[PDB]
UniProtKB/Swiss-Prot annotation, chain B:
The lineage of its organism: Bacteria, Pseudomonadati, Pseudomonadota, Gammaproteobacteria, Enterobacterales. NCBIfam families: rpoZ. Promotes RNA polymerase assembly. Latches the N- and C-terminal regions of the beta' subunit thereby facilitating its interaction with the beta and alpha subunits. Keywords: DNA-directed RNA polymerase, Nucleotidyltransferase, Transcription, Transferase. It comes from Escherichia coli O157:H7. The keyword Transcription applies. This is DNA-directed RNA polymerase subunit omega. Belongs to the RNA polymerase subunit omega family. GO terms for molecular function: DNA binding; DNA-directed RNA polymerase activity. It catalyses: RNA(n) + a ribonucleoside 5'-triphosphate = RNA(n+1) + diphosphate. The RNAP catalytic core consists of 2 alpha, 1 beta, 1 beta' and 1 omega subunit. When a sigma factor is associated with the core the holoenzyme is formed, which can initiate transcription. InterPro entries: DNA-dir_RNA_pol_omega, Pol_omega/Rpo6/RPB6, RPB6/omega-like_sf.
From Swiss-Prot, chain D:
The RNAP catalytic core consists of 2 alpha, 1 beta, 1 beta' and 1 omega subunit. When a sigma factor is associated with the core the holoenzyme is formed, which can initiate transcription. This is DNA-directed RNA polymerase subunit beta. DNA-dependent RNA polymerase catalyzes the transcription of DNA into RNA using the four ribonucleoside triphosphates as substrates. The gene is rpoB. Belongs to the RNA polymerase beta chain family.
Length: 151, 82, 745, 48, 51, 301, 165, 91
């Protein structure tokens, strides 16, 4: 989706819309719904999130919490163009991206778009938190100069 | 949770951190083991790195505990048989 | 037919018209593409052909070209540039005989321009043509220089001729760096029509050429007096000094109401004339999409301030008050076409009827008794519009599985749901349903309903053609029989179809009544044969695809408002994703009370050198200052003398200019209606390279009681305490682009 | 996440049961590469 | 039409006795700034005291 | 001992907007009460705007009606700008009928006994034929803020407009110095509002102060069935009435119906009132049926 | 008479020792109920069924009353005076007909109703077995444990219901 | 908060409609209107037996009256003062 600013963010987290969050995290929500006992078969859970009842948003805030995502601007040239954030849910339809991080992506806000990817397995969540987190990329790998310079 | 700096201060490789924390989170999630630090309804990944930061888990202690809790199971089987 | 149909069907130059704007039509038709058969290709060549040669001056526009992989290959032709007899480009000039600039135009080609010597467009001359300097800037053989007074041979015609019509609607073009003017012209092509398009306060006067000389407005053919205005049709009664002797003649303009464009916009036409109103030949009657009174209104003009506001406009972002979305002023209207065909497969044909398995009351409540959704049913994302079931297949016949398939004269039986559904995400309101039937297939009850409906509409329309033209013909008979055997009382005692056998000798008048009888009997037999042909056109089938029964087309009409993530932009290259839709209270207001609508970012100005937007902002604030003073002098119910005084002072105001209007020939009723049209602001033309200088903007900001520097001190909405170092406010004319965010997400 | 069909059905069962774990397998498009190279006169294999 | 959301202070997370951090939730949209600004100007500008 | 603000002068200089005046104020309170009351008045004031329109011969809002030179969409915008006061109702339905060449002004609405149009010169549309007439029903209701159509219609003939329930337009305060009352360093708060006629200005400033003082009120000055019947807060007689039928747990009372208990004279008239007081909490005597004792949560471990 | 009528009735899957003509009448009433569900006149859908030919018809009701509600099935005694008072208070006297309406769901619902009718065809057999041997003394096997009800299954497709009370 | 609160304590239908307005044809209204009735409240003031004792109403008019009374808004056998109920009050 299209990116936008959101300057209230801390630089390890990015804004991610509720509609994209409920679509990307359908199996985690299914697993959470089946754990509580609200439903029985898988079909029931797919009808629940197809209807989007009042109880799946708490399920969604309980699958987001410590689960990083890989934001990626479309011409990725160096390794600082894939960085992992923690989602903060957004009423809206636009990815809110912390401004300092923009100087790494070469991302202005003149109509840009970014892709989100979900680390599924557990080793991938740990690689997103321990190697690819946006707090971990504060120096450019080409030299010693900081890449989270205020723009 | 924001930074993982001391979890690399105690395991210097920064790649062995991922193996030790993945082994620890797989023991806590599916195997049903209790966390050694009291949580705040964190997910098992952050509880793994939070145990790494206390120092009470690395690869040495995990091999010690897997050998002792495999010898305990086989000892229970042998004392049940004979 | 295969050769000409393959060329017009799929060539590299027979391309799909970018139609979401009158500007985009009229600048896609004027395009000089270098690609295609016989020319070069994008991924091979090159360097020199992507560069502006010194002889594009006045033939091909230098600044309107698409950036990206093909710059300089998709050149756009300029304003005055014709095409020669052979196929080259030629442009007008003015033959400067030895002392005097003669006002004859004279077309030069590209090689005749090189031998002669051409004066630049804006060279100062004193009322006769004598060049007031003794060194004048000219160009001899592709090379600019400084020549003497009377060795010149040609002068340019007007100063707008280097640019195209895409980039001559940009006010203050001479102040923008050429990259930002390029991006501004391209995004002005990419606009979208809003719900109620307003006007440009700061235009170039080129709006009427782009609006009238395109084909979105309903230009009057013969002038006269309006007789009947309606949202559907407009009837002009033709004046007698413009009128044919036969074919009595009052014209009917059938407007084009809500229908689908190519870019899923809403090409509407609204009538803008009153009733009883005179219209002249060559004049607008019905505004089109993004037009207003015959002008060209792409986006809307809003109150802008240049200040950093708490980071929410960091790189290029835009921050918009809720006062903008409450006024429903960017709320654009989109129309999607959803098709559903009834193909012909094995186990039998398909079913469009509403006897559908696996569904209940909650789905089928929004369908009629024959599957097709109603006209007007406001649906959601994922309902059923057309119910369609195909041969599921007996396969395994159970007790009840093979049972009754025998009891019903309808072998289908259970079927496989393949009903058309609204694609997941879009709302709408079904405005129009078409049903086409391949001939031979049984028409169901709703196809017969649409056939009766269109029979009734075409019957009423041709009968009203006969009635309206017969009314004009009888008005002609009354106009002829004013003299020469007039009957003042005897005229309306008899039925009206016999107005010919009254007392009148063999003159031009009985000849004219015989000619009108010829016209009337022609209309009678023509109405008979045309109603028979129109019943034939409605009643017949249509040739269609191989093996299709019927095609159902449904038009959803979404209304997309505005949200964080849309793209807005001005007319100079100042792009931006709107980032936060603030409340009304948080906006920086001034010491009068009014909140500003949009807070831009100042830091985009010194790097991206588009300094023209700040002059456009100051002149827009001057225009709105004059509009506020008219609103103050009219809201107090003042007589027309003071309005005449102030409007005359606001229309003189300058150097030697071209306008020179006077309100002493408007006669006290037009001045009130002109002030009724000026009260939301006064429109100002600023031509491209001969625009309004700084001192004229200052003198117009002095006519209103605004501050001279253009900067008002502004308070804050949150803290309620003043911003230091007073900030720039004004009006900028901003466009919504159709790169929305609920089409990319 | 992309290619291996038995891998992704094992993944979907493992995600809806709470066990974050992947059974890797092979990309099926690599088997398509083997069939396209093998459909020439070339004999590509997988040793051991 | 008059009954808004009415808050109560959910926690007073305090450091040592002359310093505190007092939160408030939930407030109606736009009222966080007006109560923060009102309490800020009253405390910072006009309080009774001795020095 | 702070001086308290009292309203002194309400200069109704035009019909829409007025200039209320607060005096006296100690220094600093001018900007505080000014920004505070401005932000409350612009934020949330009770307005009386329009919600639904049903034109008679119109299916959807994108159609056109025969004999009116504006579309149905433009009629909806012109009705969205309608400035109307209601007095003693939540919502109200206004009726419009008009026939003949000329405008359909806002004074052509058949007014009820409490609805009051405040600007009767407001044009809606223009009828343009001798027999071509509109006949619509308008729905006007109270509200607060901006409630669009996308958030909140059952037949196909209703038309939903957006709802801008907001009476004020422009609130501007101008603090200034105060004269005698024999003390300097006092201030006057002069608030020029801009109403659309639906709200009295002193009523607006009174509702704004009530809302703000309501906001500062935050910091200004089954286990019943498992428990025994005797453990209830009521007297021993209320427990003994149920216990006479050999009942020791309230789960046994929930296992039996209240009609079955009323068919036995072991319970008294005051015991029935005590049973009603116990059942008011809805924890017992709710007409349930158990297996014998145990629910699934009541499991043996 | 598309002769398909006499080949879907005799399935005979789960239907035998039960009333054949009554099941035919019940399926006829279900089809007329569906026909009255897509109708407007809120009255009673009476199907009239023939045994000798097999073919049937659909009649509407008029439902003699002393009231005005259900107005397409509303009659009274003063309106019965035109019938010379021959109607009495309360009757369901039919005085109208209907014809036909086709759809794949029309037969689908009919088949679904026929499936339930045939199954009623699997419930009436156990609705007489209990009273087939007076007050027996009939062994049962609990198949499903419902809420305050124990369902049991016997031989020859039999179903029993044990009340917890 | 105490200071700011102390600085604010000086502030804080079928019968009423005509017979011709009915959805039925003009003959059904004219049958009642022949007895000088203009409002359906006058029709509700008189009994149906009293209307059936007058031949001004027809056989089809009786069916139309039954169709109108099926909604139970009119001809329910009521008695008014003359015209006005209490909700129908003069203001």
């Amino acid at each position: 989706s299209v990116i936008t600013v959101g300057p209230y963010l801390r630089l390890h987290q990015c804004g991610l819309p509720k509609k994209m969050a409920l679509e990307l995290f359908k199996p985690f929500i299914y697993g959470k719904l089946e754990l509580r006992g609200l439903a029985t078969t898988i079909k029931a859970a797919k009808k629940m999130v197809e209807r989007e009842e009042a109880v799946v948003w708490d399920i969604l805030d309980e699958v987001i919490r410590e689960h990083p995502v890989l934001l990626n601007r479309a011409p990725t040239l160096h390794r600082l163009g894939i960085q992992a954030f923690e989602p903060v849910l957004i009423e809206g339809k636009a990815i809110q991206l912390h401004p300092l991080v923009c100087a790494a992506y070469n991302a202005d806000f003149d109509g840009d778009q970014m892709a989100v990817h979900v680390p599924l397995t557990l080793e991938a969540q740990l690689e997103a938190r321990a190697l690819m987190m946006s707090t971990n990329n504060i120096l450019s790998p080409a030299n010693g100069e900081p890449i989270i310079v205020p723009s | 949770r924001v930074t993982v700096q001391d979890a690399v201060e105690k395991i210097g490789n920064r790649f062995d951190l991922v193996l030790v924390a993945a082994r620890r989170a797989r023991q806590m999630q599916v195997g049903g083991k209790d966390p050694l630090v009291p949580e705040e309804n964190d997910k098992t990944t952050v509880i793994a790195l939070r145990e790494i930061e206390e120092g009470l888990i690395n690869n040495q202690i995990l091999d010690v505990r897997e050998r002792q809790e495999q010898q305990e199971q086989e000892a229970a089987e042998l004392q049940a048989v004979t | 037919s295969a050769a000409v149909k393959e060329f017009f069907g799929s060539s590299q130059l027979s391309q799909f018209m970018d139609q979401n704007n009158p500007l985009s039509e009229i600048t896609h038709k004027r395009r000089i593409s270098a690609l295609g058969p016989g020319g070069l290709t994008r991924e091979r060549a090159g360097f020199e052909v992507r560069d502006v040669h010194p002889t594009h001056y006045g033939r091909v526009c230098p600044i309107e070209t698409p950036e990206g992989p093909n710059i300089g290959l998709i050149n756009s032709l300029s304003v005055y540039a014709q095409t020669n007899e052979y196929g080259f480009l030629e442009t007008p000039y003015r033959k400067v005989t030895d002392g005097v600039v003669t006002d004859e135009i004279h077309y030069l080609s590209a090689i005749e321009e090189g031998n002669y010597v051409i004066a630049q467009a804006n060279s100062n001359l004193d009322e006769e043509g004598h060049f007031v300097e003794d060194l004048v800037t000219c160009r001899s053989k592709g090379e600019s220089s400084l020549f003497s007074r009377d060795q010149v041979d040609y002068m340019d015609v007007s100063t707008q001729q280097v640019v195209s019509v895409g980039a001559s609607l940009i006010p203050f073009l001479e102040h923008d760096d050429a990259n930002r003017a390029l991006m501004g012209a391209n995004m002005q092509r990419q606009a979208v029509p809003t719900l109620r398009a307003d006007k440009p306060l700061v235009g170039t006067g080129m709006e009427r050429a782009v609006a009238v000389d395109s084909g979105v407005t309903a230009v009057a053919k013969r002038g006269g007096v309006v007789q009947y205005v309606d949202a559907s049709r407009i009837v002009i009664k033709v004046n007698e000094d413009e009128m044919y002797p036969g074919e009595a003649g009052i014209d009917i303009y059938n407007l084009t109401k809500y229908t689908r464009s190519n870019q899923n916009t809403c090409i509407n036409q609204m009538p803008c004339v009153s009733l009883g109103e005179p219209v002249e030949r060559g004049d607008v009657l019905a505004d089109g999409p993004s037009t207003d009174l015959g002008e060209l209104a792409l986006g809307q003009n809003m109150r802008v301030a240049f200040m950093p506001w708490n980071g929410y406009n960091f790189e290029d972002s835009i921050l918009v008050s809720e006062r903008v979305v409450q006024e429903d002023r960017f709320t654009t209207i989109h129309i999607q076409e959803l098709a559903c065909v009834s193909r012909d497969t094995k186990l039998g044909p398909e079913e469009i009827t509403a006897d559908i398995p696996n569904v209940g009351e909650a789905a089928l409540s929004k369908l009629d008794e024959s599957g097709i959704v109603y006209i007007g049913a406001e649906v959601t994302g994922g309902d059923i519009l057309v119910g369609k079931v195909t041969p599921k297949g007996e396969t395994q016949l159970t007790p009840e599985e093979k049972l009754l398939r025998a009891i019903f004269g309808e072998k289908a039986s259970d079927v496989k749901d393949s009903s058309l559904r609204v694609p997941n995400g879009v709302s709408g309101t079904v405005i129009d349903v078409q049903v086409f039937t391949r001939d031979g297939v049984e028409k169901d009850k709703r196809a017969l309903e649409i056939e009766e409906m269109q029979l009734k509409q075409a019957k009423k329309d041709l009968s009203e053609e006969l009635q309206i033209l017969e009314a004009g013909l009888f008005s002609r008979i009354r106009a002829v029989l004013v003299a020469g055997g007039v009957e003042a009382e005897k005229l309306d005692k008899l039925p009206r179809d016999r107005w010919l056998e009254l007392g009148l000798t063999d003159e031009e008048k009985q000849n004219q009544l015989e000619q009108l009888a010829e016209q009337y009997d022609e209309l009678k037999h023509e109405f008979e044969k045309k109603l028979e042909a129109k019943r034939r056109k409605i009643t017949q089938g249509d040739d269609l695809a191989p093996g299709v029964l019927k095609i159902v087309k449904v038009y959803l009409a979404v209304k997309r408002r505005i949200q964080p993530g849309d793209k807005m932009a001005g007319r100079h290259g100042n792009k931006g994703v709107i980032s936060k839709i603030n409340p009304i209270e948080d906006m920086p207001y001034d010491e009068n009370g009014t909140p500003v609508d949009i807070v831009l970012n100042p830091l985009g100005v010194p790097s991206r050198m588009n300094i023209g937007q700040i002059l456009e902002t100051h002149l827009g604030m001057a225009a709105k200052g004059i509009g506020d003073k008219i609103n103050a002098m009219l809201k107090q119910q003042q007589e027309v003398a003071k309005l005449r005084e102030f409007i005359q002072r606001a229309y003189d105001l300058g150097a030697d200019v071209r306008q020179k209007v006077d309100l002493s020939t408007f006669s006290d009723e037009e001045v009130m209606r002109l002030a009724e049209n000026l009260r939301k602001g006064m429109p100002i033309a600023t031509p491209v390279f001969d625009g309004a200088k700084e001192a004229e903007i200052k003198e117009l900001l002095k006519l209103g009681d605004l501050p001279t520097s253009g900067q008002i001190r502004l308070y804050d909405g949150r803290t309620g305490e003043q911003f230091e170092r007073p900030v720039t406010v004004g009006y900028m004319y901003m466009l919504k682009l159709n790169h929305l965010v609920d089409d990319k997400m | 996440k992309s290619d291996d069909v038995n891998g992704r059905t094992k993944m979907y069962k493992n995600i809806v049961d709470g066990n974050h774990q992947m059974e890797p397998g092979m990309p099926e498009s690599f088997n398509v590469l083997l069939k396209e190279i093998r459909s020439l006169g070339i004999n590509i294999e997988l040793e051991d | 039409v008059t009954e808004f959301l009415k808050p109560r202070l959910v926690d007073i997370e305090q450091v040592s006795s002359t310093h505190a951090k007092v939160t408030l939730e939930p407030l109606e949209r736009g009222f966080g700034h007006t109560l923060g600004n009102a309490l800020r100007r009253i405390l910072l500008s006009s309080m009774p005291g001795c020095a | 001992e702070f001086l308290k603000p009292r309203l002194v002068d309400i200069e109704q200089v035009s019909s829409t907007h007025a200039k209320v005046t607060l005096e006296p104020l100690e220094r600093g309170f001018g900007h505080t009460l000014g920004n505070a009351l401005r932000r409350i008045l612009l934020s949330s004031m009770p307005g009386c705007a329009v919600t639904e329109v049903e034109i008679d011969g119109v299916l959807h809002e994108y159609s056109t009606k025969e004999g009116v030179q504006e579309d149905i969409l433009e009629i909806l915008l012109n009705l969205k700008g309608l400035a109307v006061r209601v007095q003693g109702k939540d919502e109200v339905i206004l009726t419009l009928n008009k026939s003949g060449i000329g405008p359909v002004t806002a004074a052509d609405i058949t007014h009820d006994g409490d609805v009051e149009i405040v600007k009767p010169q407001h044009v809606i549309c223009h009828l343009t034929d001798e027999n071509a007439s509109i006949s619509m029903r308008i729905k006007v209701q109270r509200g607060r803020g901006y409630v669009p159509a996308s958030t909140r219609e059952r037949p196909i003939g209703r038309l939903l407009v957006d709802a801008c329930y907001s009476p004020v337009e422009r609130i501007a305060y101008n603090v200034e110095a105060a004269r005698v009352e024999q003390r300097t360093d006092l201030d006057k708060l002069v608030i020029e509002m801009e109403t659309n006629g639906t709200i009295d200005p002193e009523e607006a400033i009174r509702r704004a102060a009530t809302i703000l003082a309501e906001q500062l009120e935050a910091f200004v000055d089954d286990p019943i069935l498992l428990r025994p019947v005797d453990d209830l807060e009521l007297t021993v007689r209320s427990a003994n009435c149920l216990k006479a039928e050999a009942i020791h747990y309230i789960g046994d009372l929930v296992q039996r119906t209240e009609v079955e208990l009323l068919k036995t004279p072991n319970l008294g008239k005051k015991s029935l009132t005590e049973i009603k007081d116990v059942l008011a909490s809805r924890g017992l005597s709710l007409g349930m049926r158990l297996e014998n004792w145990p629910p699934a949560s009541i499991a043996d471990e | 008479m598309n002769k398909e009528i006499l080949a879907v009735v005799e399935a005979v899957s789960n239907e035998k020792a039960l009333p054949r003509e009554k099941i035919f009448e019940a399926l006829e009433s279900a089809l007329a109920t569906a026909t009255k569900k897509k109708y407007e006149q809120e009255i009673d859908v009476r199907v009239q069924i023939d045994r000798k030919s097999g073919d049937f018809d659909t009649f509407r009701r008029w439902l003699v009353v002393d009231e005005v509600t259900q107005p397409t099935k509303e009659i009274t005694l003063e309106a019965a005076r035109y019938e010379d008072e021959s109607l009495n208070l309360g009757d369901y006297v039919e005085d109208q007909i209907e014809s036909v309406t086709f759809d794949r769901i029309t037969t689908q619902t009919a088949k679904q109703v026929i499936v339930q009718k045939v199954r009623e065809a699997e419930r009436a057999m156990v609705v007489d077995q209990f009273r087939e041997h007076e007050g027996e003394i009939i062994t049962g096997v609990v198949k499903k444990v419902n809420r305050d009800n124990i369902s049991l299954d016997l031989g020859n497709n039999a179903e029993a219901v044990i009340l917890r009370e």
